[PDB]
Amino acid sequence: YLMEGSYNKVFLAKGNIPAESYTFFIDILLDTIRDEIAGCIEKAYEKILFTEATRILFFNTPKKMTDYAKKRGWVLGPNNYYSFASQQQKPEDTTIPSTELAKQVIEYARQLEMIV
Amino acid sequence: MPYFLLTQAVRTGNLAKFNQVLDQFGEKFQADGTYTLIIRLRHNVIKTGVRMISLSYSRISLADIAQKLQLDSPEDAEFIVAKAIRDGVIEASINHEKGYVQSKEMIDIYSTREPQLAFHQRISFCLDIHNMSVKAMRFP
Amino acid sequence: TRPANHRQLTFEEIAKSAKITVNEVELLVMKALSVGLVKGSIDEVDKRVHMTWVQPRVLDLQQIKGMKDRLEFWCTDVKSMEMLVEHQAHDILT
Amino acid sequence: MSEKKQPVDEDNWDDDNVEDDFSNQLRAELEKHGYKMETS
Amino acid sequence: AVQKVVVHPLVLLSVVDHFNRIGKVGNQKRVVGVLLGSWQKKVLDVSNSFAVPFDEDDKDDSVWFLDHDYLENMYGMFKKVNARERIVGWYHTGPKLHKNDIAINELMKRYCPNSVLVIIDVKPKDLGLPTEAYISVEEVHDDGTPTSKTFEHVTSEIGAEEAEEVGVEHLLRDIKDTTVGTLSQRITNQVHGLKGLNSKLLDIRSYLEKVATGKLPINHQIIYQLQDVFNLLPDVSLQEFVKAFYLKTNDQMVVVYLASLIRSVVALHNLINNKIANRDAEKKEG
C-alpha cells in the first residue's frame, strides 16, 4: 500500500489492527503520512476544491490545514485552492545549462587529448 | 518456463494477470528464494500501465481509467498519479473538479542532454578499447 | 533610456509619448526606418513595436559611471570563465 | 572452463517480442474479428 | 586603399641587428630606417630594407633629420641589384611613436605616393603578434576643424615565400612543428582566451582610467559610439540559441558514432594481426 501509495487504503487498514502495541507506532505512521499528503498533492495539480481536501485531512475544520496554509504557501483561496505560481517556479532553464553544457565538453575534449 | 510466463505477465499492464502467476507458479519461487522481488514488482507493474496510458492518451478520465487497470476505486486514481509526478513518471498536469486528467507532449530539450550523457560512456569506452589494444600490442 | 532588452515596445507607449493617433504611428516610426536611426520592425497585427539596434547620442556623467561599471562587469566574468577553460586543460599541456 | 562455480549447479527475436504481445492479446485473430461484425 | 601588410623575418631581423649596431654606441631614442616594400597586389609585402642614421635633438624635441644623399645612393644600389624592390615607406623600433612622427612621412612622400610606416619591437614581451602598421590618411571631422592627419591601423602578418622560410624554420630547433590535428589547435585554443583576456583587460583598465585622467577629450566622440556598439550584444538566449543546443549536440552525434565506428576497426587490425604474429611466431622458435 506504500507503493500505491496509501493514504486512504492504509486509513482503512489502520482502523483494524490486532495489533498489538502498534498504537505507539501507528501514531508516528499517522504524522509521517499526513505531511506526505501535503508534499505529494502538489506539485503538480492545477487546483483542488476545499471540502475535497477536507475529506483527506479528516477531522472537521482542523488547525492542521491552517498550519498547512502557513507551511505550504502556496496559496489559500476562497472555497478552493491553487498551485500558483506557477506549477512551480517555471524552469526554462535558458542560459543556466549552457554553462555545464560547455563544461561537460571541456573534460570531454580532455578525454580526446588523453588518447591522444 | 514458469519464470518466462512471469516476465510475460509483468510487461503487460494487467494487474490481475500478474497476480495469477504468483499463485500458480509461486511454488517454484520458494526454491529460488526470489519472493524478495515479488512484493516490490507490483510498483513497477502499476508504473508501467500508467506510463502506457500516459503517452497513448491525450486526455484521460480518472474514474474511467480504474476499470481497465482494476484500480477499483476513484481515490487511488489520484494516488498513483501523485507519486507518478513525484517520481517524474509523467509531466501531465491534472485538474481536480470532476475531476479530469490532461497530458501534454514536450520535447526539443531531448537530444541536448541524453546523447551527451551517453557519449561520455561511449568515448571513454572507445579510448579504453584503445588502451587495452595498445597494452597487448606492445608485448612483442 | 530603458535598460532593456526587453527592447520591444507597444503602441500605447508611442501613443502616450507622441500624443498622436494610432493610425499615424505608422508613418511616424517608418520615417525613422528610412532615416536609419533605428532598424526595429513593427508588429501591425498586435500594433506592437519591436525595436532593434539603437542610435547612440552624446552621454552623461552618470552614464559614464554606469558605463565603466557595466563595462568592467564584462572583463571580470570572461576572465573568470576563461580561467576555468584553462583550468581543466592545464594538466594535459605541461 | 569448468572450474569453480559452475559445477555447483536480423533476427526473429526483436519481432518475437511483438509476437509475444500478440500471444497474450487479441489472439491472432480471425474469428473475433468476424464475430464483431454482427454484434452491432 | 591598403588592406593588410606582410613583413618577412629577414627584413625584421635587419632592423634588430642594426639595433645592435647603434646599441654599443648608444644612446637614446630608437632605430629609424626606410622600408623597402614589394607591391604585387592590394596586399602589401616587404622583403628587405636599409638603415639610415637618425638623431632627434631634445630642445628641439620635435626636430628630426635624415640623410637624403645616403638614401639616394643606397636605394640606387638596391635598385641596381634588385629591380623589383622599391621603397614602400619607413620604419622605427618605437616601442611607441611620438607626435613628431607625423612630418617624417611628409618628407619622403616625394619618394612614394603613399608611405606606410611600420613600428617594430626589438625586445619581445607582450602582448602578441609583433610590430605594427600605420597608413597616413585624412578623415577630417564632423566638427569642421582644420584637417587633422591621424594614422590608421593596418593589419600586419608575418610571412615568406620559399628560401626565406628555410633559414627561419631552420634556426629555431626548439618547439614541435606543427603539429596539426593534436597540439596545434589546443595550444592556440588557450591562446585565444589568454590573448583575448589580456588585450581586453589592459584596454578596459584604460577605459576606466581615461575619464579620471587623460581628459580631454577623451570621450568624446569615438568612445561613446563604440560603447553602445559594445552594448549591442548581451548576448545569449532567449530564444533560438536554446534551439542551437540539440543541433550542436546532433552535429556531435554522427561524430561520436564515426569515432566508435573506427575505434573497433583499429582494435580489429591491431589485435588480430598482433596476437597471431605473437603466439604463432613464438611457437616456431621454441
Q: In sequence order, what DSSP letters do the residues of A55-85 get, joined into one string?
A: HHH-SSS-SHHHHHHHHT-S--BTTB---TT
Contacts of D20 in chain B (CB under 8 A): 8
Measured CA to CA, the distance from residue B5 to residue D13 in angstroms comes to 17
Q: How many CB atoms lie within 10 A of CB C70?
A: 13
CB pairs under 8 A between C and E: 57
Measured CA to CA, the distance from residue E157 to residue E133 in angstroms comes to 10
Contacts of A46 in chain B (CB under 8 A): 93-96
Residue E207 has which C-alpha cell? 577605459
CB B17 within 8 A of CB B48: no
- Compute φ and ψ for C32, nearest 5 degrees: -65, -35
Amino acid, single-letter form, for residue A86: S
Chains C and B lie in contact, requiring 3 or more CB pairs less than 8 Å apart: no
Who's near E29: CB < 8 A, 6+ residues apart? Answer: E54, E55, E56
Q: Using CB atoms, which residue from E182, E186, E238 is nearest to A94?
A: E238
CB A101 within 8 A of CB B119: no
Strand, coil or helix: A21: coil
Specify the length of chain A in residues.
116
Measured CA to CA, the distance from residue D18 to residue A9 in angstroms comes to 36
Element (H, E) at C9: strand C8-9
Experimental method: cryo-EM
E186 and C CB contact within 8 Å? yes
CB E93 within 8 A of CB E122: yes
The per-type count for chain D, helices as H runs and strands as E runs, is 2, 0
Q: Is E182 exposed, middle or buried (0-12, 13-18, 19+ CB in 10 A)?
A: middle
- Could you tell me the CA-to-CA distances from A96 to A103, A107, C82, E241 in Å, in that order? 12, 18, 17, 12
Give CA angle at E192 (E159, E251), nearest 5°: 105
CB B25 within 8 A of CB B5: yes
Q: In chain B, which ranges are continuous DSSP H helix?
A: 2-11, 15-32, 35-56, 62-65, 75-86, 113-137
Residue E154 has which C-alpha cell? 593596418
Name the CA radius of gyration of chain D, rounded.
21
Q: Is E98 exposed, middle or buried (0-12, 13-18, 19+ CB in 10 A)?
A: middle
Contact partners for chain E, using 3 or more CB pairs closer than 8 A, are: A, B, C
What is the distance in angstroms between the Cα of A35 and the nearest Cα belonging to chain E? Answer: 38
C94 and A CB contact within 8 Å? no
Measured CA to CA, the distance from residue E49 to residue E45 in angstroms comes to 12
Q: What is the DSSP string of C24-52?
A: GHHHHHHHHHHHTS----B-SSS--EE--
C84 and A CB contact within 8 Å? yes
Q: How many CB atoms lie within 10 A of CB C55?
A: 12
For β-strands E4-7 and E155-158, DSSP reports them as parallel
Q: Is E143 exposed, middle or buried (0-12, 13-18, 19+ CB in 10 A)?
A: exposed
- Compute φ and ψ for A17, nearest 5 degrees: -140, 140
Residue C58 has which C-alpha cell? 552624446
Measured CA to CA, the distance from residue B17 to residue B123 in angstroms comes to 43
Element (H, E) at A96: helix A96-113
What is the distance in angstroms between the Cα of C30 and the nearest Cα belonging to chain E? Answer: 22
Instruction: State the maximum Cα–Cα separation within chain A, in Å, rounded to a whole number.
Output: 71
Measured CA to CA, the distance from residue D12 to residue D25 in angstroms comes to 19
Whether E242 sits inside 8 A of A113 (CB atoms) is no
Element (H, E) at B102: strand B100-102
> Which residue does chain A place closest to B41, by CA atoms?
A3
Contacts of B54 in chain A (CB under 8 A): none
Contacts of E207 in chain C (CB under 8 A): 68, 71
Element (H, E) at B100: strand B100-102
Who's near E67: CB < 8 A, 6+ residues apart? Answer: E52, E53
Give CA angle at D28 (D23, D31), nearest 5°: 135
- Compute φ and ψ for C8, nearest 5 degrees: -80, 135
Residue E209 has which C-alpha cell? 582610467
Residue window 5-24, chain D: list those with CB within 8 Å of chain B.
20, 23-24
Residues with their C more than 2.5 Å from the N of the next written residue in chain D, i.e. before a break, are 9
Nearest residue to E255 via CA among B122, B132, B133, C92: B122
- Long-range contacts, A84-87 (Cβ 8 Å, 24+): A87/A43, A87/A44, A87/B93
Whether C84 sits inside 8 A of A113 (CB atoms) is no
Measured CA to CA, the distance from residue B123 to residue B127 in angstroms comes to 6
Beta bridge pairs of residue E4: E155
- Could you tell me the CA-to-CA distances from B113 to A111, E8, E158, E245, E274 in Å, in that order? 19, 49, 44, 9, 39
Measured CA to CA, the distance from residue E86 to residue E156 in angstroms comes to 19
Q: Which of A110, A111, A116 to mutate to test the interface with C (most CBs of C within 10 A)?
A: A110
CB E228 within 8 A of CB C54: yes
**Residues on A contacting C at a C-beta cutoff of 8 Å:** 103, 106-107, 109-110, 113-114
What is the distance in angstroms between the Cα of C79 and the nearest Cα belonging to chain A? Answer: 15
Whether B46 sits inside 8 A of A3 (CB atoms) is yes
Who's near B8: CB < 8 A, 6+ residues apart? Answer: D20, D23, D24
Q: What is the DSSP string of E160-220?
A: --SHHHHHHHHHH--S----TTTHHHHHHHHHHHHHHHHHHHHHHHHHHHHHHSS-SS-SS
Who's near A37: CB < 8 A, 6+ residues apart? Answer: A7, A56, A57
Nearest residue to E90 via CA among E67, E61, E73: E67
Q: What is the DSSP string of chain E?
A: ---EEEE-HHHHHHHHHHHHHHHHH--SS--EEEEEEEESSSSEEEEEEEE---B--STTTT--B--HHHHHHHHHHHHHH-SS-EEEEEEE--SS--TTHHHHHHHHTTT-SSPEEEE--SS--SSSS----EEEEE---TT-PSP-EEEEE-EEEE---SHHHHHHHHHH--S----TTTHHHHHHHHHHHHHHHHHHHHHHHHHHHHHHSS-SS-SSSHHHHHHHHHTT-----SSGGGHHHHHHHHHHHHHHHHHHHHHHHHHHHHHHHHHHHHHHHHHHH-
Amino acid, single-letter form, for residue C70: R
E260 and B CB contact within 8 Å? yes
Residue E75 has which C-alpha cell? 636605394
